[PDB]
Design an enzyme around this catalytic site. Structure first.
Site, PDB file in Angstrom:
ATOM      1  N   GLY A  11       1.910  14.339   2.656  1.00  0.00           N
ATOM      2  CA  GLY A  11       2.365  12.867   2.507  1.00  0.00           C
ATOM      3  C   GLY A  11       1.147  12.052   2.869  1.00  0.00           C
ATOM      4  O   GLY A  11       0.472  12.171   3.864  1.00  0.00           O
ATOM      5  N   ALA A  12       1.222  10.990   2.155  1.00  0.00           N
ATOM      6  CA  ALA A  12       0.024  10.085   2.108  1.00  0.00           C
ATOM      7  C   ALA A  12       0.568   8.434   2.388  1.00  0.00           C
ATOM      8  O   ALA A  12       0.554   7.609   1.759  1.00  0.00           O
ATOM      9  CB  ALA A  12      -0.501   9.836   0.921  1.00  0.00           C
ATOM     10  N   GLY A  13       0.805   8.581   3.484  1.00  0.00           N
ATOM     11  CA  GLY A  13       1.626   7.243   3.947  1.00  0.00           C
ATOM     12  C   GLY A  13       0.776   6.645   5.395  1.00  0.00           C
ATOM     13  O   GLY A  13      -0.418   6.878   5.378  1.00  0.00           O
ATOM     14  N   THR A  14       1.495   6.102   6.186  1.00  0.00           N
ATOM     15  CA  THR A  14       0.676   5.399   7.475  1.00  0.00           C
ATOM     16  C   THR A  14      -0.022   6.551   8.229  1.00  0.00           C
ATOM     17  O   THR A  14      -1.101   6.304   8.785  1.00  0.00           O
ATOM     18  CB  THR A  14       1.586   4.585   8.141  1.00  0.00           C
ATOM     19  OG1 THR A  14       2.372   3.517   7.352  1.00  0.00           O
ATOM     20  CG2 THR A  14       0.919   3.809   9.240  1.00  0.00           C
ATOM     21  N   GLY A  15       0.667   7.699   8.469  1.00  0.00           N
ATOM     22  CA  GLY A  15       0.116   8.811   9.110  1.00  0.00           C
ATOM     23  C   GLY A  15      -0.824   9.706   8.233  1.00  0.00           C
ATOM     24  O   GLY A  15      -1.995   9.974   8.587  1.00  0.00           O
ATOM     25  N   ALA A  38       4.327  12.617  -2.901  1.00  0.00           N
ATOM     26  CA  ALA A  38       5.270  12.496  -3.673  1.00  0.00           C
ATOM     27  C   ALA A  38       4.696  11.193  -4.571  1.00  0.00           C
ATOM     28  O   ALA A  38       5.160  11.424  -5.810  1.00  0.00           O
ATOM     29  CB  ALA A  38       6.637  12.127  -2.980  1.00  0.00           C
ATOM     30  N   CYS A 163      15.077   1.638  12.848  1.00  0.00           N
ATOM     31  CA  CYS A 163      14.052   0.844  12.414  1.00  0.00           C
ATOM     32  C   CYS A 163      15.069  -0.529  12.288  1.00  0.00           C
ATOM     33  O   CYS A 163      15.151  -1.053  11.243  1.00  0.00           O
ATOM     34  CB  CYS A 163      13.615   1.170  11.302  1.00  0.00           C
ATOM     35  SG  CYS A 163      12.086   0.322  10.840  1.00  0.00           S
ATOM     36  N   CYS A 359       5.543  -3.730  17.196  1.00  0.00           N
ATOM     37  CA  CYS A 359       6.375  -4.261  15.587  1.00  0.00           C
ATOM     38  C   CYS A 359       5.992  -5.509  15.489  1.00  0.00           C
ATOM     39  O   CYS A 359       6.211  -6.369  16.342  1.00  0.00           O
ATOM     40  CB  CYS A 359       7.799  -4.033  15.765  1.00  0.00           C
ATOM     41  SG  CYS A 359       8.683  -4.523  14.240  1.00  0.00           S
TER      42      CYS A 359
HETATM   43  C1  LIG Z   1      10.663  -1.578   6.590  1.00  0.00           C
HETATM   44  C2  LIG Z   1       9.694  -1.127   7.709  1.00  0.00           C
HETATM   45  C3  LIG Z   1       8.837  -2.106   8.285  1.00  0.00           C
HETATM   46  C4  LIG Z   1       8.007  -1.430   9.359  1.00  0.00           C
HETATM   47  N1  LIG Z   1       7.144  -2.244  10.076  1.00  0.00           N
HETATM   48  C5  LIG Z   1       6.278  -1.686  11.026  1.00  0.00           C
HETATM   49  C6  LIG Z   1       5.485  -2.630  11.789  1.00  0.00           C
HETATM   50  O1  LIG Z   1       5.553  -3.673  11.580  1.00  0.00           O
HETATM   51  N2  LIG Z   1       4.866  -2.054  12.857  1.00  0.00           N
HETATM   52  C7  LIG Z   1       4.760  -0.702  13.093  1.00  0.00           C
HETATM   53  O2  LIG Z   1       3.811  -0.100  13.838  1.00  0.00           O
HETATM   54  N3  LIG Z   1       5.747   0.134  12.218  1.00  0.00           N
HETATM   55  C8  LIG Z   1       6.468  -0.359  11.283  1.00  0.00           C
HETATM   56  N4  LIG Z   1       7.295   0.515  10.534  1.00  0.00           N
HETATM   57  C9  LIG Z   1       7.395   1.967  10.708  1.00  0.00           C
HETATM   58  C10 LIG Z   1       5.987   2.908  10.785  1.00  0.00           C
HETATM   59  O3  LIG Z   1       5.113   2.202  11.084  1.00  0.00           O
HETATM   60  C11 LIG Z   1       6.251   2.971   8.926  1.00  0.00           C
HETATM   61  O4  LIG Z   1       7.616   3.426   9.005  1.00  0.00           O
HETATM   62  C12 LIG Z   1       5.226   4.067   8.663  1.00  0.00           C
HETATM   63  O5  LIG Z   1       5.229   3.972   7.412  1.00  0.00           O
HETATM   64  C13 LIG Z   1       5.867   5.467   8.951  1.00  0.00           C
HETATM   65  O6  LIG Z   1       4.589   6.423   8.690  1.00  0.00           O
HETATM   66  P1  LIG Z   1       4.921   7.764   8.209  1.00  0.00           P
HETATM   67  O7  LIG Z   1       3.321   8.276   8.044  1.00  0.00           O
HETATM   68  O8  LIG Z   1       5.383   8.572   9.302  1.00  0.00           O
HETATM   69  O9  LIG Z   1       5.736   7.724   6.905  1.00  0.00           O
HETATM   70  P2  LIG Z   1       5.301   7.172   5.388  1.00  0.00           P
HETATM   71  O10 LIG Z   1       4.623   5.818   5.641  1.00  0.00           O
HETATM   72  O11 LIG Z   1       6.861   6.895   4.989  1.00  0.00           O
HETATM   73  O12 LIG Z   1       4.655   8.094   4.531  1.00  0.00           O
HETATM   74  C14 LIG Z   1       5.488   9.370   4.197  1.00  0.00           C
HETATM   75  C15 LIG Z   1       4.707   9.884   3.140  1.00  0.00           C
HETATM   76  O13 LIG Z   1       4.975  11.245   2.739  1.00  0.00           O
HETATM   77  C16 LIG Z   1       5.405  11.198   1.318  1.00  0.00           C
HETATM   78  N5  LIG Z   1       6.568  12.388   1.194  1.00  0.00           N
HETATM   79  C17 LIG Z   1       7.860  12.476   1.637  1.00  0.00           C
HETATM   80  N6  LIG Z   1       8.511  13.414   1.059  1.00  0.00           N
HETATM   81  C18 LIG Z   1       7.421  14.322   0.369  1.00  0.00           C
HETATM   82  C19 LIG Z   1       7.361  15.698  -0.190  1.00  0.00           C
HETATM   83  N7  LIG Z   1       8.490  16.454   0.190  1.00  0.00           N
HETATM   84  N8  LIG Z   1       6.252  15.891  -0.546  1.00  0.00           N
HETATM   85  C20 LIG Z   1       5.135  15.192  -0.678  1.00  0.00           C
HETATM   86  N9  LIG Z   1       5.105  14.104   0.015  1.00  0.00           N
HETATM   87  C21 LIG Z   1       6.473  13.549   0.530  1.00  0.00           C
HETATM   88  C22 LIG Z   1       6.044   9.958   0.992  1.00  0.00           C
HETATM   89  O14 LIG Z   1       6.063   9.560  -0.181  1.00  0.00           O
HETATM   90  C23 LIG Z   1       5.132   9.042   1.951  1.00  0.00           C
HETATM   91  O15 LIG Z   1       3.849   8.732   1.190  1.00  0.00           O
HETATM   92  C24 LIG Z   1       8.169  -0.046   9.505  1.00  0.00           C
HETATM   93  C25 LIG Z   1       8.914   0.847   9.002  1.00  0.00           C
HETATM   94  C26 LIG Z   1       9.755   0.167   7.864  1.00  0.00           C
HETATM   95  C27 LIG Z   1      10.763   1.212   7.068  1.00  0.00           C
HETATM   96  C1  LIG Z   2      -0.832  -2.153  23.650  1.00  0.00           C
HETATM   97  C2  LIG Z   2      -0.588  -1.089  22.423  1.00  0.00           C
HETATM   98  C3  LIG Z   2      -1.291  -1.391  21.223  1.00  0.00           C
HETATM   99  C4  LIG Z   2      -1.266  -2.555  20.693  1.00  0.00           C
HETATM  100  C5  LIG Z   2      -0.886  -2.610  19.027  1.00  0.00           C
HETATM  101  C6  LIG Z   2      -2.012  -2.908  18.103  1.00  0.00           C
HETATM  102  C7  LIG Z   2      -1.995  -4.127  17.445  1.00  0.00           C
HETATM  103  C8  LIG Z   2      -1.629  -4.028  15.801  1.00  0.00           C
HETATM  104  C9  LIG Z   2       0.141  -3.740  15.653  1.00  0.00           C
HETATM  105  C10 LIG Z   2       0.483  -2.189  15.545  1.00  0.00           C
HETATM  106  C11 LIG Z   2       0.650  -1.920  14.041  1.00  0.00           C
HETATM  107  C12 LIG Z   2       0.333  -0.698  13.805  1.00  0.00           C
HETATM  108  C13 LIG Z   2      -0.433   0.078  14.347  1.00  0.00           C
HETATM  109  C14 LIG Z   2       0.511  -0.220  12.525  1.00  0.00           C
HETATM  110  O1  LIG Z   2      -0.149   1.025  11.783  1.00  0.00           O
HETATM  111  C15 LIG Z   2       1.142  -0.911  11.473  1.00  0.00           C
HETATM  112  O2  LIG Z   2       1.412  -0.589  10.188  1.00  0.00           O
HETATM  113  C16 LIG Z   2       2.635   0.322   9.849  1.00  0.00           C
HETATM  114  C17 LIG Z   2       1.583  -2.297  11.888  1.00  0.00           C
HETATM  115  O3  LIG Z   2       2.269  -2.761  11.141  1.00  0.00           O
HETATM  116  C18 LIG Z   2       1.646  -3.979  10.659  1.00  0.00           C
HETATM  117  C19 LIG Z   2       1.508  -2.640  13.256  1.00  0.00           C
HETATM  118  O4  LIG Z   2       1.828  -3.772  13.846  1.00  0.00           O
END
Ligand SMILES: Cc1cc2nc3c(=O)[nH]c(=O)nc-3n(C[C@H](O)[C@H](O)[C@H](O)COP(=O)(O)OP(=O)(O)OC[C@H]3O[C@@H](n4cnc5c(N)ncnc54)[C@H](O)[C@@H]3O)c2cc1C
Ligand SMILES: CCCCCCCCCCC1=C(C)C(=O)C(OC)=C(OC)C1=O
Ligand SMILES: Cc1cc2nc3c(=O)[nH]c(=O)nc-3n(C[C@H](O)[C@H](O)[C@H](O)COP(=O)(O)OP(=O)(O)OC[C@H]3O[C@@H](n4cnc5c(N)ncnc54)[C@H](O)[C@@H]3O)c2cc1C
Ligand SMILES: CCCCCCCCCCC1=C(C)C(=O)C(OC)=C(OC)C1=O
Ligand SMILES: [S]
Ligand SMILES: [S]
Lengths: 421, 421
Positions: A11-15, A38, A163, A359
């Site tokens: 998975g190539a997302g935020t984490g 994916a 969420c 958030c």
């Molecule tokens: C609308 C929205 C707004 C958000 N806003 C914020 C915010 O402002 N601040 C904050 O801190 N967090 C926010 N979040 C939450 C969180 O930070 C995000 O959901 C973040 O993207 C989650 O990171 P992740 O790495 O767990 O999953 P994702 O970023 O969803 O990445 C998962 C990856 O795994 C891949 N994958 C899934 N299944 C498979 C498979 N079987 N095989 C291969 N790849 C696969 C997907 O394609 C994707 O690339 C928000 C979430 C949402 C939904």
């Molecule tokens: C005091 C606790 C830590 C403060 C947080 C750091 C400031 C930046 C916001 C956090 C954030 C992270 C980490 C982040 O990864 C992310 O993307 C998914 C955001 O959405 C824009 C975020 O808002």
């Protein structure tokens, strides 16, 4: 392989994307690091609500992954995993190929459980979604179609959602946009439906004055709000809503016509991961210890939305607590450290640290953001802030993170604290 | 002395006490570190408002210094400096003794400029003060005397003040206490007088919704508030107030009778420091560079309220921006590093970092706190928070800091961030 461990990040997302860079940096040329996803592109998910109202476009928030990770020595496979055999340590891809690992780090994010509410899939009716850039475009497309033939609007969050911020955000910017185009008065009913027990609960028992501020915000925009709601089905372009009381008893059923709708769905674990025997709880979330290691498989780690985190309250209508960016990055950082430690004979001791939720929601010129920690009250930090400076920080952070995802992360990621030093 | 530099720290307060420990730790047994202060005890100043309403006592917030610093190898002189000869590098003490230094770090805090307003000295009339534990006791004593013979109350902040939080805090807790004893209704007029151009300006152009929250708070308590005010004199138990407009023109003069009063005075530099030719601006604040080094004397450093910081706005009635604890500690840390560097042949490069203001005000069960940075808007952080968790943090921090002042500080002080790690 023996003496040269092969590490796979799923998975190539935020984490996952940061995990790939960090893993490679940690391990070096002697170990193989493979990133499997994916999609062949990274998307900055917090931007999707804005895509969904047409305030951003795909090419502003997404980019192709291959070149950026490959130039770091990372192997990239743009394929979904369909099966994981934990015993043989084999991943079966969509195209039927298998990839073997010595260590696996699962970062697969959420399965959007549209199946919980018959008819709620964005392809099955008028209820759209903004969690992915694919779906947010579809959301905007439908928004454009409401512009042509105005009708009732229903935005909110399903039972089981975790969420909520984005739901409030989407509802506010839609209102805002209806005016900047000048057509707000064409809407017969703008309705906010949430599984939260009260406005601004946010799945975290509220934060600062989130209740009062969000309640006032929805009123200001002429949006009628209902809490303690679960949607039983979407059918015939009508949303069927049951509102309950503190004990779960029905206090009203509603049938709402929807011309344009958006409900944040419940999250589950993705099928390939949920499908691994004994790896997950019943929701399909990976059961891990404090070190991000699977409780069952010592060579499986996990990070992000994909991990299980036990509830700390039980709301009238089921809800979850969000897993957000800073905590996700701490999980990633811990998993990387501890895999490295494993490869060298020690038990990694690094943890994700204190639970926290952060958030940022940008309204246009002003944004709202919250910081809460730890999970249970009374908290050490419980802040909900509003101001143009929040908008400016969201803009600044998205630019930063996208740049970091192209340039590489070492790294003790957030030294985004030297706005002090 | 040559090859064994003698470092003197002048003032044992929030900046000076940590400075002594840190200096000694930095330098070691080969160098002499002397701490010189007007009082033989340390007081935790943010607690003084509570002393002033009788919610805390002296022995909860103050302790004798000698034993704690001496056991660290620090020489302690409980004497006020009366004269500093920058050329000969001699400090003349109150008892006429002189102390020579190779390096001097000035941490003398504020002179309370009661002389700006004839009659406003706590010993000259009914207008008291809560900046020192000595004065806060006197404030409480007078409060007890208002309990006996109720009359008009006037709390606020003089022209030139830079420390507004405590004024709001004192006004709120007095209100609160008047009720817990049950006697609020005995007051003919409770009045808040401030030099701020508007409620919640706080000398920092407001922070978050400080205006709305503080305005609402004063109303809730039945306190009438006037802004853009300067007190011309206190006489015959009457406060003479001039209220001005945006351009300084008088819009009203008021004569307020005072049975019990408290106005935060303007701060100046203490006389011994202000008296050093070319060391200070006209207010008596030490002119330093980014490294905390005097612009005139290379072997004089300074930290805390004692340094000069240029204004960034000019208000209808003169006001200043506060110098608060985290920034003070950064200044101290920088000065220590750079003195050490000097003793070893290099120019220290450490700075105090980004300007910031932090302030916690405890109301009893709930507190308000603000964080603002940098100084000018739009800011990177602009937060004003209210909640019982603020009260809990203030309680926790005072306990921590007092303990740290007895046990010693190494130190990169605030790793009070591992409520994360
Ligand atoms: C609308 C929205 C707004 C958000 N806003 C914020 C915010 O402002 N601040 C904050 O801190 N967090 C926010 N979040 C939450 C969180 O930070 C995000 O959901 C973040 O993207 C989650 O990171 P992740 O790495 O767990 O999953 P994702 O970023 O969803 O990445 C998962 C990856 O795994 C891949 N994958 C899934 N299944 C498979 C498979 N079987 N095989 C291969 N790849 C696969 C997907 O394609 C994707 O690339 C928000 C979430 C949402 C939904
Ligand atoms: C005091 C606790 C830590 C403060 C947080 C750091 C400031 C930046 C916001 C956090 C954030 C992270 C980490 C982040 O990864 C992310 O993307 C998914 C955001 O959405 C824009 C975020 O808002
Ligand atoms: C009522 C009040 C509440 C505050 N609350 C907060 C808060 O909540 N948070 C925050 O961050 N900041 C707060 N501050 C501001 C700031 O943190 C304190 O003022 C802090 O004490 C200033 O530190 P300092 O080291 O510069 O001066 P001080 O702590 O005042 O120490 C100066 C020392 O020098 C000594 N001295 C003076 N003249 C001489 C002399 N000639 N010879 C020898 N010694 C001398 C004094 O006796 C004193 O010990 C508050 C300030 C006040 C007045
Ligand atoms: C984001 C910027 C830094 C956050 C501030 C740290 C948290 C603690 C509050 C600051 C503080 C300091 C440093 C402090 O030294 C002090 O005493 C004078 C306070 O009064 C209680 C304080 O409130
Ligand atoms: S979605
Ligand atoms: S004072």
């Amino acid at each position: 392989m023996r003496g040269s461990a092969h590490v796979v990040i799923l998975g190539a997302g935020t984490g996952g994307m940061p995990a790939a860079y960090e893993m490679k940096e940690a391990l070096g040329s002697g170990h193989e690091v493979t990133l499997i996803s994916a999609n062949d592109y990274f998307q900055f998910v917090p931007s999707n609500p804005w895509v969904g109202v047409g305030w951003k476009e795909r090419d502003d928030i997404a980019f192709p992954i291959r070149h950026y990770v490959e130039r770091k020595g990372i192997h990239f496979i743009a394929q979904s995993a369909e099966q994981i055999d934990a015993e043989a340590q084999n991943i079966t891809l969509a195209d039927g190929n298998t990839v073997h690992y010595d260590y696996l780090m699962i970062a697969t994010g959420p399965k959007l459980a549209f199946e919980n509410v018959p008819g709620s899939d964005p392809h099955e009716g008028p209820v759209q979604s903004i969690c992915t850039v694919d779906h947010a475009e579809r959301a905007f497309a439908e928004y454009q179609a409401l512009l042509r033939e105005p009708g009732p609007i229903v935005i909110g969050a399903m039972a089981g959602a975790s969420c909520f911020g984005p739901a409030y955000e989407y509802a506010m910017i839609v209102a805002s946009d209806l005016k900047k185009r000048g057509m707000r008065d064409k809407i017969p009913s703008f309705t906010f439906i949430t599984s939260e027990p009260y406005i601004g609960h946010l799945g975290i028992q509220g934060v600062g004055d989130s209740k009062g501020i969000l309640t006032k915000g929805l009123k200001e925009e002429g949006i009628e709000a209902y809490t303690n709601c679960k949607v039983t089905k979407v059918e015939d372009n009508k949303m069927y809503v049951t509102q309950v009381d503190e004990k779960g008893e029905t206090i009203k059923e509603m049938v709402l016509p929807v011309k344009f709708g958006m409900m944040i769905p419940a999250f589950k674990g993705v099928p390939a991961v949920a499908g691994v025997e004994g790896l997950c709880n019943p929701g399909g979330f990976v059961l891990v210890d404090e070190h991000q290691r699977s409780k069952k498989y010592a060579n499986i780690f996990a990070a992000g939305i994909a991990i299980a985190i036990p509830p700390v309250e039980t709301t009238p209508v089921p809800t979850g607590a969000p897993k957000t960016g800073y905590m996700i990055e701490s999980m990633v950082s811990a998993a990387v450290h501890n895999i490295k430690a494993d490869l060298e004979g020690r038990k990694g001791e690094q943890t994700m640290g204190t639970w926290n939720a952060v958030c940022f929601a940008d309204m246009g010129d002003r944004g709202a953001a919250f910081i809460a920690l730890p999970q249970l009250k009374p908290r050490k930090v419980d802040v909900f802030a509003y101001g143009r400076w929040v908008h400016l920080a969201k803009v600044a952070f998205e630019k930063y993170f996208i740049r970091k995802m192209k340039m590489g992360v070492s790294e003790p990621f957030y030294e985004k604290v030297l706005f002090k030093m």
